[PDB]
Design a protein around this nucleic acid. Structure first.
Ligand SMILES: Nc1nc2c(ncn2[C@H]2C[C@H](O)[C@@H](COP(=O)(O)OP(=O)(O)OP(=O)(O)O)O2)c(=O)[nH]1
Ligand SMILES: [Ca+2]
Ligand SMILES: [Ca+2]
Ligand SMILES: [Ca+2]
Ligand SMILES: [Ca+2]
Ligand SMILES: [Ca+2]
Length: 903
DNA sequence: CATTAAGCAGTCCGCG
DNA sequence: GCGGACTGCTTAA
């Protein structure tokens, strides 16, 4: 088999590499790497090395990495460019693996762990690690085993061994309901003292040294806690055994009233699952407890226990250990669905970077581009310092706030990467400039043609048409991968709807789910079989289809993020290829493209409808247009349609067969105007929206820019079994909006769009009457808690103190003296509730850590003093007022002359 | 070591 | 009480 790295580190003049050899064995080696860098040399110098602008370079081979570093400094002092890869481990990986890396994940040791630490005096700080570690569960992906290290004797209590038999039993039978499918994979190890637990865990760690180290919050809690506890008990040399190279780095972060630390373990790639989730999931969650995320991802209930976690081990050691095990497994379950570890491995090996560098788009692209250029014997430019400079982005159209009955939307495929490729935007393809006219002159095709020789952007840049750019070349590779996965995702999505349609008529039989590949549209034969399947088999198939869709989503959306990240990176001062000429060439071209096609679509639709000067395009943002389709429907007449699906089909056909070709013609002209390298402006129909035929639904509304709701029947070729709400920007979409309020506002919207004003009025009345009965957590607002210290004046709010911070300070006063109350952590999220006048907390609101019940000693008073009137007004009524006034609709029946009568 | 556009909630302040 | 700067937060793209 081909060899591949596991980890790589630079320690002084040594490269330390863990790798898999040709026999598939894990190996380690220390290499005294001899790096090369480059200097510009005279033209008369015969060389095989050229910089990206074609200037000749001489290679300088150094005896060691320090020598190479010191030469860089001398060159800086001289005032001459020192070219080449300055991150030497990237050069090392490039030299060692001079081929496309084909890796085997089964040979990669992925470790998932978590620890338990009983603490009678508040949160057990990792930097101090003053309490015993009393449990570790460590799952190893090679053994496929949960290794459980259980402390039986502690200063905080002596306990009996955990029982696997009780653990497997249903909770309703007094058990812990440890999932049956892992019961046989648990290796249980009790310990009479912490020293032998820890010693044995370290020996175990040596035998089974993680390559990928993950788990929930491992980087901020488990890793630094274990490292520090071992340091305190055995000494720091022993703690360094957690590094296969015995080298660590301690990062102390000062928070005025916190002081925590992160530990770098050289030769291990830590990918904290919370960080992976935040980066790759494209959610913004109100809480990041494993409980909350597990419920969201897996629809599993919270791990329940009685009393505080500080007393769980002594009162219920059986449950304590089971919950430690289950928490480890839950992360594995989330990853089985989301596949972020797989994604990280794919991306890291593709780029030839340390796996943990997938968190950095700049590092990822630096390595991809370096590897591409190195292949052509080209030499990369030195990184330079640049002052931070704001620059212009996308165009957003101001919509007229209103209801919009029939809407069809269109948007550009992968816009910014497509612009890069169409225009040929790269550091080394710049051909010169032209004299800019105002943007609106390009939009309206009145400005002089920029160039008849080079490929142009309306920002004034010109690019070579007849040569490849590393940026277009490498962005295309990732785009093509992205396109493949999105195809799989969309096929699975359409397949899902086929199954959902079939679930309307399930067959009364005993059968099995069809063995199919959900990444491809079902054949006619498969569809015929599906129509004869039982509900049980259909529901199993639907789970499999959705799981396939999620996998495709992870794969496509994060590749989309990577390529959009390159367009953004051009505008980041730390990027080797930072260049506002290139960054603005993209954004400015995008603004022209949107407004050009707005014009073209208005012209086309007026023509085919036989009118003049009517505005069909009601809105647009960055690369999308929203077309009012009322006049299209009215042209044929609503009466002609048999049902909703009839007009949906009609608009679908209209968009594909009439509008899209016209759009294509419009963009091809634009391409010729800018004399671009390749026409890649592909604008396809996105949504078809409207009310159910014969209903009083309004179909859609806009309140303003980035704020709208649409009742969608077809999205990007997926014909829904049931209409789906597309809501963007409104409070239903925001993590700061109370959970029950998101739900109620969405139902208000559903009623508006699908049923009409009276239906809305009926729901509002009901919700207002029942609001006070909702659980306090379901009606609490949410906010991130940043710069808490800044506004803290003796426990009271300083000037300009934000509302949520005021709540935190109220909470801090209420819990002061009590050691057993949960502390608010700087930068994390809190629930927030307004408080009635004269409350015993002595302020207008309280805030506490999100995803938690508010501590028992103050929960009673919060409930009593909660301001329901303020909460309803602020979170529910005011946003609804926004929606309904925009839609020209009332949520409460207004007074009328009819009030004089008895109905 | 490492993208911009834009809406809304809230504080401070002016206001016989 | 409610608008106009200005901060903070969180979206859409
Ligand atoms: N830097 C950066 N730019 C973004 C991001 N999301 C969107 N944009 C910019 C670049 C996109 O090309 C453009 C249009 O956004 P879309 O959401 O329509 O995505 P895009 O067209 O890239 O892909 P698509 O094929 O429509 O899924 O807006 C992002 O997360 N980061
Ligand atoms: Ca725990
Ligand atoms: Ca798009
Ligand atoms: Ca059937
Ligand atoms: Ca879009
Ligand atoms: Ca599309």
């Amino acid at each position: 088999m081909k060899e591949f790295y596991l980890t790589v580190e630079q320690i002084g003049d040594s490269i330390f590499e863990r790798y898999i050899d040709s026999n598939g064995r894990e190996r380690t080696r220390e290499v005294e790497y001899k790096p090369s860098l480059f200097a510009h040399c005279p033209e008369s110098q015969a060389t095989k090395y050229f910089d990206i602008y074609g200037k000749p370079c001489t290679r300088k081979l150094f005896a060691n990495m320090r020598d190479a570093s010191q030469w860089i400094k001398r060159m800086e002092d001289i005032g001459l460019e020192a070219l080449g890869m300055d991150d030497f481990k990237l050069a090392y990986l490039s030299d060692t693996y001079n081929y496309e890396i084909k890796y085997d994940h089964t040979k990669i040791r992925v470790a998932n762990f978590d620890i338990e630490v009983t603490s009678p005096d508040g949160f057990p700080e990792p930097s101090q690690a003053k309490h015993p570690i009393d449990a570790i569960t460590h799952y190893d992906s090679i053994d496929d085993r949960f290794y459980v290290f259980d402390l039986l004797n502690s200063p905080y209590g002596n306990v009996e061994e955990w029982s696997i038999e009780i653990a497997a039993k249903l909770q309703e039978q007094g058990g812990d309901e440890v999932p049956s499918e892992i019961i046989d994979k648990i290796i249980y190890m009790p310990f009479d003292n912490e020293k032998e637990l820890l010693m044995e865990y370290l020996n175990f760690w040596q035998q089974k040294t993680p390559v990928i180290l993950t788990g929930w919050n491992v980087e901020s809690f488990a890793i630094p806690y274990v490292y520090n506890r071992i340091k305190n008990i055995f000494g720091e040399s022993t703690a360094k055994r957690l590094s296969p190279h015995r080298k660590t780095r301690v990062k102390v972060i000062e928070n005025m009233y916190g002081s925590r630390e992160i530990i770098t373990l050289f030769g291990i790639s830590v990918l904290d699952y919370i960080d992976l989730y935040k980066k790759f999931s494209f959610t913004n969650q109100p809480s990041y407890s494993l409980d909350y995320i597990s419920e969201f991802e897996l629809n599993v209930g919270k791990l329940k226990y009685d009393g505080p976690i500080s007393k769980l081990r002594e009162s219920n050691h059986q449950r304590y250990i089971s919950y430690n095990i289950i928490a480890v497994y839950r992360v594995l379950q989330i990853d089985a669905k989301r596949q972020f570890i797989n994604l990280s491995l794919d991306m890291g090996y593709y780029a030839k970077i340390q796996i943990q560098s997938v968190f950095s788009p700049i590092k990822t692209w630096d390595a991809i581009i370096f590897n591409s250029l190195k292949e052509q014997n080209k030499v990369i430019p030195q990184g330079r310092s640049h002052p931070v400079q704001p620059y212009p982005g996308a165009f957003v159209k101001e919509p007229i706030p209103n209801r919009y009955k029939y809407v069809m939307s269109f948007d550009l495929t992968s816009l910014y990467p497509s612009i890069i490729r169409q225009v040929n935007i790269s550091p080394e393809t710049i051909a010169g400039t032209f004299k800019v006219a105002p943007l609106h002159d390009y939009i309206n095709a009145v400005a002089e043609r920029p160039s008849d020789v080079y490929s142009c952007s309306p920002n004034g840049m010109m690019y070579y048409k007849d040569r490849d750019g590393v940026v277009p070349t490498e962005i295309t590779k990732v785009f093509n991968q992205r396109k493949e996965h999105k195809g799989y995702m969309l096929a699975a999505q359409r397949n899902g709807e086929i199954i959902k349609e079939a679930l309307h008529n399930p067959n009364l039989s005993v059968d099995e789910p069809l063995d199919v590949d959900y990444r491809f549209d079902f054949s006619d034969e498969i569809k015929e079989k599906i129509k004869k399947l039982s509900a049980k088999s259909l529901n199993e198939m639907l789970f499999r289809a959705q799981r396939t869709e999620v996998a495709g989503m992870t794969a496509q959306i994060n590749r989309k993020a990577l390529i959009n990240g390159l367009a953004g990176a051009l505008g980041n001062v730390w990027f080797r290829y930072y260049d506002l000429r290139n960054a603005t060439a993209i954004t400015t071209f995008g603004q022209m493209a949107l407004q050009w096609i707005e014009r073209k679509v208005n012209e086309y639709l007026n023509e085919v409808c036989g009118t003049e000067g009517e505005a069909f395009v009601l809105y647009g943002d960055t690369d999308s247009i929203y077309v009012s389709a009322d006049k299209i429907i009215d042209k044929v007449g609503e009466s002609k349609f048999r049902d909703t699906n009839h007009w949906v089909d009609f608009l679908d056909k209209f968009a594909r067969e009439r509008m899209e070709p016209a759009i294509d013609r419009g963009f091809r002209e634009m391409c010729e105007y800018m004399n671009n390298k390749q026409h890649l402006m592909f604008m396809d129909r996105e949504a078809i929206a409207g009310p159910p035929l014969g209903s009083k639904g309004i179909g859609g509304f806009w309140t303003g820019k980035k704020r709208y709701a649409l009742n969608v029947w077809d999205m990007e070729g997926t014909r829904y079994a049931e209409p789906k709400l597309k809501i963007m920007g409104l409070e239903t979409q925001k993590s700061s909006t109370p959970k029950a309020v998101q739900k109620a506002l969405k139902e208000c919207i559903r009623r508006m769009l699908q049923e009409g004003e009276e239906s809305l009025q009926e729901y509002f009345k009901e919700f207002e009457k029942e609001f006070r009965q909702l659980n306090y957590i379901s009606i609490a607002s949410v906010s991130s808690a940043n710069n808490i210290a800044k506004y803290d004046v003796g426990g009271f709010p300083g000037p300009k103190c934000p509302f949520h911070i005021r709540g935190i300070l109220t909470y801090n006063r209420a819990i002061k003296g009590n050691i057993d109350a949960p502390q608010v952590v700087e930068g994390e999220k809190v629930y927030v509730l307004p408080l009635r006048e004269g409350n015993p907390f002595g302020d207008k609101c309280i805030a506490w850590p999100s995803g938690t019940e508010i501590t028992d000693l103050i929960k009673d008073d919060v409930l009593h003093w909660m301001d329901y009137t303020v909460l309803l007004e602020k979170t529910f009524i005011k946003p609804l007022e926004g929606f309904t006034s925009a839609a020209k609709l009332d949520y409460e029946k207004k007074a009328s002359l009819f009030d004089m009568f008895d109905f």
